[PDB]
Design an enzyme around this catalytic site. Sequence first.
Site, mmCIF file in Angstrom:
data_model
loop_
_atom_site.group_PDB
_atom_site.id
_atom_site.type_symbol
_atom_site.label_atom_id
_atom_site.label_comp_id
_atom_site.label_asym_id
_atom_site.label_seq_id
_atom_site.Cartn_x
_atom_site.Cartn_y
_atom_site.Cartn_z
ATOM 1 N N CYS A 108 40.375 39.927 28.132
ATOM 2 C CA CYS A 108 39.921 41.237 28.612
ATOM 3 C C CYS A 108 39.952 42.302 27.535
ATOM 4 O O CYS A 108 41.025 42.682 27.028
ATOM 5 C CB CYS A 108 40.725 41.700 29.835
ATOM 6 S SG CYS A 108 40.210 43.297 30.528
ATOM 7 N N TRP A 280 35.016 48.712 35.450
ATOM 8 C CA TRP A 280 33.645 49.145 35.168
ATOM 9 C C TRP A 280 33.026 48.304 34.032
ATOM 10 O O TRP A 280 33.730 47.606 33.303
ATOM 11 C CB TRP A 280 33.577 50.652 34.856
ATOM 12 C CG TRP A 280 34.459 51.115 33.743
ATOM 13 C CD1 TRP A 280 34.216 51.010 32.390
ATOM 14 C CD2 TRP A 280 35.714 51.797 33.869
ATOM 15 N NE1 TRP A 280 35.256 51.571 31.678
ATOM 16 C CE2 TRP A 280 36.191 52.049 32.564
ATOM 17 C CE3 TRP A 280 36.500 52.190 34.962
ATOM 18 C CZ2 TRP A 280 37.407 52.716 32.325
ATOM 19 C CZ3 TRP A 280 37.707 52.833 34.726
ATOM 20 C CH2 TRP A 280 38.146 53.097 33.414
HETATM 21 C C1 HEM Z 1 38.486 48.961 33.448
HETATM 22 C C2 HEM Z 1 37.393 48.548 32.791
HETATM 23 C C3 HEM Z 1 37.329 47.103 32.262
HETATM 24 C C4 HEM Z 1 36.519 46.689 31.276
HETATM 25 C C5 HEM Z 1 35.520 47.561 30.441
HETATM 26 C C6 HEM Z 1 36.771 45.275 31.115
HETATM 27 C C7 HEM Z 1 36.184 44.429 30.218
HETATM 28 C C8 HEM Z 1 36.136 43.057 30.353
HETATM 29 C C9 HEM Z 1 35.091 42.186 29.851
HETATM 30 C C10 HEM Z 1 33.811 42.634 29.090
HETATM 31 C C11 HEM Z 1 35.459 40.939 30.131
HETATM 32 C C12 HEM Z 1 34.694 39.629 29.836
HETATM 33 C C13 HEM Z 1 33.617 39.664 30.891
HETATM 34 C C14 HEM Z 1 32.798 38.417 30.894
HETATM 35 O O1 HEM Z 1 32.226 38.049 29.842
HETATM 36 O O2 HEM Z 1 32.715 37.812 31.973
HETATM 37 C C15 HEM Z 1 36.720 40.960 30.836
HETATM 38 C C16 HEM Z 1 37.390 39.822 31.276
HETATM 39 C C17 HEM Z 1 38.484 39.839 32.120
HETATM 40 N N1 HEM Z 1 39.117 40.981 32.595
HETATM 41 FE FE1 HEM Z 1 38.512 42.941 32.207
HETATM 42 N N2 HEM Z 1 37.770 44.881 31.996
HETATM 43 C C18 HEM Z 1 38.102 45.961 32.770
HETATM 44 C C19 HEM Z 1 39.023 45.948 33.819
HETATM 45 C C20 HEM Z 1 39.741 44.861 34.293
HETATM 46 C C21 HEM Z 1 40.613 44.839 35.441
HETATM 47 C C22 HEM Z 1 40.857 46.034 36.405
HETATM 48 C C23 HEM Z 1 41.164 43.620 35.524
HETATM 49 C C24 HEM Z 1 42.172 43.125 36.589
HETATM 50 C C25 HEM Z 1 43.071 43.956 37.150
HETATM 51 C C26 HEM Z 1 40.642 42.817 34.447
HETATM 52 C C27 HEM Z 1 40.976 41.507 34.133
HETATM 53 C C28 HEM Z 1 40.156 40.633 33.460
HETATM 54 C C29 HEM Z 1 40.281 39.186 33.510
HETATM 55 C C30 HEM Z 1 41.305 38.337 34.300
HETATM 56 C C31 HEM Z 1 39.188 38.670 32.600
HETATM 57 C C32 HEM Z 1 38.844 37.181 32.327
HETATM 58 C C33 HEM Z 1 37.780 36.839 33.361
HETATM 59 C C34 HEM Z 1 37.481 35.369 33.394
HETATM 60 O O3 HEM Z 1 38.287 34.540 32.844
HETATM 61 O O4 HEM Z 1 36.393 35.056 33.970
HETATM 62 N N3 HEM Z 1 39.803 43.610 33.702
HETATM 63 N N4 HEM Z 1 37.150 42.282 30.902
HETATM 64 N N1 LIG Z 2 37.541 31.917 33.446
HETATM 65 C C1 LIG Z 2 36.247 31.639 33.745
HETATM 66 C C2 LIG Z 2 35.780 30.317 33.736
HETATM 67 C C3 LIG Z 2 34.442 30.057 34.064
HETATM 68 C C4 LIG Z 2 33.594 31.122 34.406
HETATM 69 C C5 LIG Z 2 34.098 32.430 34.416
HETATM 70 C C6 LIG Z 2 33.223 33.619 34.772
HETATM 71 C C7 LIG Z 2 32.075 33.836 33.773
HETATM 72 C C8 LIG Z 2 32.531 34.365 32.399
HETATM 73 N N2 LIG Z 2 31.410 35.195 31.948
HETATM 74 C C9 LIG Z 2 30.320 35.197 32.915
HETATM 75 C C10 LIG Z 2 31.075 34.893 34.215
HETATM 76 O O1 LIG Z 2 31.849 36.043 34.585
HETATM 77 C C11 LIG Z 2 31.127 37.160 35.074
HETATM 78 C C12 LIG Z 2 32.131 38.164 35.615
HETATM 79 N N3 LIG Z 2 32.903 38.855 34.584
HETATM 80 C C13 LIG Z 2 33.230 40.257 34.797
HETATM 81 C C14 LIG Z 2 34.598 40.612 34.183
HETATM 82 C C15 LIG Z 2 34.887 42.107 34.373
HETATM 83 C C16 LIG Z 2 34.261 43.107 33.619
HETATM 84 C C17 LIG Z 2 34.564 44.464 33.828
HETATM 85 C C18 LIG Z 2 35.491 44.831 34.809
HETATM 86 C C19 LIG Z 2 36.108 43.836 35.561
HETATM 87 F F1 LIG Z 2 37.015 44.133 36.501
HETATM 88 C C20 LIG Z 2 35.815 42.498 35.345
HETATM 89 N N4 LIG Z 2 35.398 32.654 34.089
#
Ligand code: HEM
Ligand SMILES: Nc1cccc(C[C@@H]2CNC[C@@H]2OCCNCCc2cccc(F)c2)n1
Lengths: 411, 407
Positions: A108, A280
């Site tokens: 993140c 966001w």
């Molecule tokens: C507040 C503004 C936030 C921004 C700008 C942000 C930004 C991002 C971005 C760009 C990613 C990768 C997204 C992707 O490629 O799918 C990400 C992943 C992630 N974020 Fe954030 N984030 C924010 C808030 C949060 C919040 C509120 C949480 C949880 C309380 C969180 C937890 C996570 C987790 C667990 C991942 C990994 C997702 C996955 O494995 O699919 N983030 N974040």
């Molecule tokens: N851990 C894994 C494993 C497999 C697939 C995935 C979701 C994929 C990662 N990349 C595209 C899709 O996830 C799309 C959703 N990602 C948004 C994360 C985000 C952004 C801003 C604020 C916020 F709260 C959360 N995760």
Amino acid sequence: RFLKVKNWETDVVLTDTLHLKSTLETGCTEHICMGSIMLPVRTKDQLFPLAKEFLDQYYSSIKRFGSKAHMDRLEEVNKEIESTSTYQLKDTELIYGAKHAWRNASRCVGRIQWSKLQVFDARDCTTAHGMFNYICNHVKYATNKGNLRSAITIFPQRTDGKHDFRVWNSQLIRYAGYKQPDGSTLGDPANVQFTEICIQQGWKAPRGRFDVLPLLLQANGNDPELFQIPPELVLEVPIRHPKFDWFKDLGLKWYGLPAVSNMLLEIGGLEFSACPFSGWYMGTEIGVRDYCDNSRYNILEEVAKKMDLDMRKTSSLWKDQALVEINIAVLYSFQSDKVTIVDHHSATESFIKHMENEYRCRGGCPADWVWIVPPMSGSITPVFHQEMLNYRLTPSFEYQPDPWNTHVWKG
Amino acid sequence: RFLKVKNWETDVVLTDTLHLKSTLETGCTEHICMGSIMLPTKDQLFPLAKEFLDQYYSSIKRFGSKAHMDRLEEVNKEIESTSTYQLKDTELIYGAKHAWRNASRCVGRIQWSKLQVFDARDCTTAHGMFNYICNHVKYATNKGNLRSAITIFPQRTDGKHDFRVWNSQLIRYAGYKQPDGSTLGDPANVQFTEICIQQGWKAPRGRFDVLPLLLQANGNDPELFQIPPELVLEVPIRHPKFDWFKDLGLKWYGLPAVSNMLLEIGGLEFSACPFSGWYMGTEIGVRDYCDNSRYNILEEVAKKMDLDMRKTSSLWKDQALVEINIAVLYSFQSDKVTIVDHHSATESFIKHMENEYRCRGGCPADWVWIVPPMSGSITPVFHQEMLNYRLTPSFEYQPDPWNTHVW
Ligand code: HEM
Ligand SMILES: Nc1cccc(C[C@@H]2CNC[C@@H]2OCCNCCc2cccc(F)c2)n1
Ligand code: HEM
Ligand SMILES: Nc1cccc(C[C@@H]2CNC[C@@H]2OCCNCCc2cccc(F)c2)n1
Ligand SMILES: C[C@H](O)[C@H](O)[C@H]1CNc2nc(N)[nH]c(=O)c2N1
Ligand SMILES: C[C@H](O)[C@H](O)[C@H]1CNc2nc(N)[nH]c(=O)c2N1
Ligand SMILES: [Zn+2]
């Protein structure tokens, strides 16, 4: 032991001690690195130690480690585990736990914000209808008419793994995908399979390019049920370009609230399999990935056609040119409608400052470079040049398999 | 044991078994991944030699043949007596080709088997090294129609007699600190540019001064030589649409030639082994030109484009970056100097991966280096899972000699 990371742009060198508190495995060994692999019912026995680690962390953070209140709480949790095989978190512990899962989320880029998180306690929820209400409220609170606020809603924890609460959607708000008989897709290709389940469950599909999917919600291990989010709660932004007037006629829009609903939150050994959270967008998530992935809306050709770019050879960088314009449009559109969004320059620069601060105050900041570096213009962002260490801390957010693959249908 | 890699764009799944032949350590453990870190006797030599000759004889389909067994005995006898051994020409060619084949950070390996090897093991002096190097540069350049090559100087002995090329690349531009406070030319080479002047180089003190070679033969103090200018093919940079671009005064050299690495074959260490191929456009246009600690030209280019540099969210850096890279590719193409764009390069690497999976059982790859420094996710490598592990023969990083040498 002490591990150093270097920034090759600034020569700033940092020292990591926090990695010593890491328990879980990474996927890697001394012989193989799995840093680019996407995915690399507990007993009383293993539970109390997990609870204990957690409560020690909690009580240290409030500067009460070893206090009578700390010790009474250990004894009380201990006795609850031996009696009921599980335990309940206090509100204070739940809030602290959820903030820390976010703080520990190495993929993140948005973590400068970790301590400002609205926690909604949904542990009294018992039905799908209950879950729908909680989620509507979360959506409304988080959206805040464009002035987005981070939030998470936490439903009841796992018990025997036969009574799980789950949100079947991967995000609260996402668009339908429809595979056509001729092989083409209408809408979002990522959501075809889920769209199909919704239709089978009785959803009447409008069948357009941007149909907001219904929520499919499972309470207490029961078969999931469908619900339409009230449209007035679903903030959307039509995409237009500051200089290109034909951009609007592509008919693009996107939703303002990114809200992940398919992860599992672990706190002190407890498992919250429904814990949707939202923040966001960084602009690139929409403009690069959602619009420009070949397996997504795939708009590069059409945008480049309208731009009259030389499309005969890749070496004109027509794709690269069109990609930037699309991303300009996304940021411009959100800003014009006063919907919170962050560009990838500002987001990565803030992450660097967060990361340095975390080293000073916490002794480390686990980070996954493969994910932190934005999917366009990598090396002109400061994260590209930042060495990072990736390791797993609890509390944590975990991937879980999609529930339609595991669910026992009751009928 | 048997590991899978998935491409998330195509759904293709590949099975890796080649990693089970992996030998060296990664830097990672079960507790910590170090994927993004840039730098993570007689008894010792014989297993290494055996491992190598076993794979060599297996490759020519003579595993467990009399010629195979005979060569293992011969190399063993030589070690037992001399404390080292010498490679046959055939083994050298194979070893060098395979070091490239095993280079997990190299996107260009589709080309691995077309490598011209220059055996310079008979070299004894810096002047000799200079002659071999000029010949390499001229052969590889080929008037703009670039050909992959490596030149291999004598192996390490007692380690007090190393051959080294002190330059990090055969061809690089000087960097000078100024009273002004800023930097003239390439800030990456300031230290080296000083050591050269400290050795007697008369620097022209311009923005694009080709550095002298600084060659160390046989563990002796190193010496300076200017590469004949007529052998250094350079490309003036212009834009196909922006007239004003040429006025920035930008040029780059056509031949990328890494000269600071260590080639390890069957336990033997070749510490001077300069090699060269041809550029992927992004190395120059994204990294050399736009890195903040490099030529750092974004600010000036954006100004000429009259973009709004008020706020980061106008993506002015991103717009300029693209045009700079269009220019680099266009200029090279117009002067008929081999160059590959990042789309075509990564597409080629995916095809190479698939070839290597079916033919060899895998392909070690470092995603952090393979994904280009611009437009990552619109190239196919972004979506490709990769497994990173270390195979021999190999190229290894070695520290700058000035830290190690005694004068
Ligand atoms: C507040 C503004 C936030 C921004 C700008 C942000 C930004 C991002 C971005 C760009 C990613 C990768 C997204 C992707 O490629 O799918 C990400 C992943 C992630 N974020 Fe954030 N984030 C924010 C808030 C949060 C919040 C509120 C949480 C949880 C309380 C969180 C937890 C996570 C987790 C667990 C991942 C990994 C997702 C996955 O494995 O699919 N983030 N974040
Ligand atoms: N851990 C894994 C494993 C497999 C697939 C995935 C979701 C994929 C990662 N990349 C595209 C899709 O996830 C799309 C959703 N990602 C948004 C994360 C985000 C952004 C801003 C604020 C916020 F709260 C959360 N995760
Ligand atoms: C034929 C054209 C070639 C192309 C397009 C190419 C491409 C690349 C690129 C883009 C990199 C990353 C370099 C950087 O960002 O600094 C790289 C690294 C590397 N390549 Fe190649 N390559 C080519 C030929 C070769 C040859 C001939 C060899 C050796 C015989 C080689 C071995 C290596 C090694 C060892 C690295 C990592 C260098 C380091 O760690 O600094 N490549 N390659
Ligand atoms: N392994 C390491 C460790 C530290 C530093 C370095 C060299 C840095 C890395 N990144 C920029 C610079 O390396 C210099 C550029 N390398 C060109 C690679 C190449 C391309 C095409 C053909 C060919 F023969 C060789 N390596
Ligand atoms: C195979 C590779 O790990 C995969 O494509 C990753 C790369 N980096 C990513 N980074 C982010 N932020 N989101 C992603 O989905 C991915 N996908
Ligand atoms: C810290 C990080 O490992 C470092 O910036 C790397 C990232 N990827 C790279 N990739 C290539 N091809 N070349 C590089 O120099 C780097 N630098
Ligand atoms: Zn690793």
